[PDB]
Amino acid sequence: KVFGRCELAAAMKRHGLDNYRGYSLGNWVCAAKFESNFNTQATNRNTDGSTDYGILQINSRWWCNDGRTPGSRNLCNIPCSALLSSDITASVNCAKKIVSDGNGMNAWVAWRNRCKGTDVQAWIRGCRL
Ligand SMILES: [Cl-]
Ligand code: NA
Numbered sequence: 612k613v614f615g616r617c618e619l620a621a622a623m624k625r626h627g628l629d630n631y632r633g634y635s636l637g638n639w640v641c642a643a644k645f646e647s648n649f650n651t652q653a654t655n656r657n658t659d660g661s662t663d664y665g666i667l668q669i670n671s672r673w674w675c676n677d678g679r680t681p682g683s684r685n686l687c688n689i690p691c692s693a694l695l696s697s698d699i700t701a702s703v704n705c706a707k708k709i710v711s712d713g714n715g716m717n718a719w720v721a722w723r724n725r726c727k728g729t730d731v732q733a734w735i736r737g738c739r740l
Pocket of ligand 1: 675677679
């Protein structure tokens, strides 16, 4: 599924991400825009054998099991295919686990490069949340 910007903001709101571990809602919407262009089916296959899955491009080396990633752990306790659903719940529940892992949202390369430092409230303009 592809989300619209405000549609995704609403969905993330309802999953309690606003101010989750100190990160306002705009952060998460911005992250999703630049990681996956709002696409729940996005995949990116890397040179280390890992794959980034779903709307927040969660990586298979640490966080999910896809059966084909070298030296893999499964800290979200889920198959990676669960992150490819039109339902963002699994992605949100695993993202919560990741942002609490000590380096906040710098776990997302697109956030740290494209969102960090900017006025992220703009991502929820016009949404009427
Ligand atoms: Cl695996
Ligand atoms: Na894994």
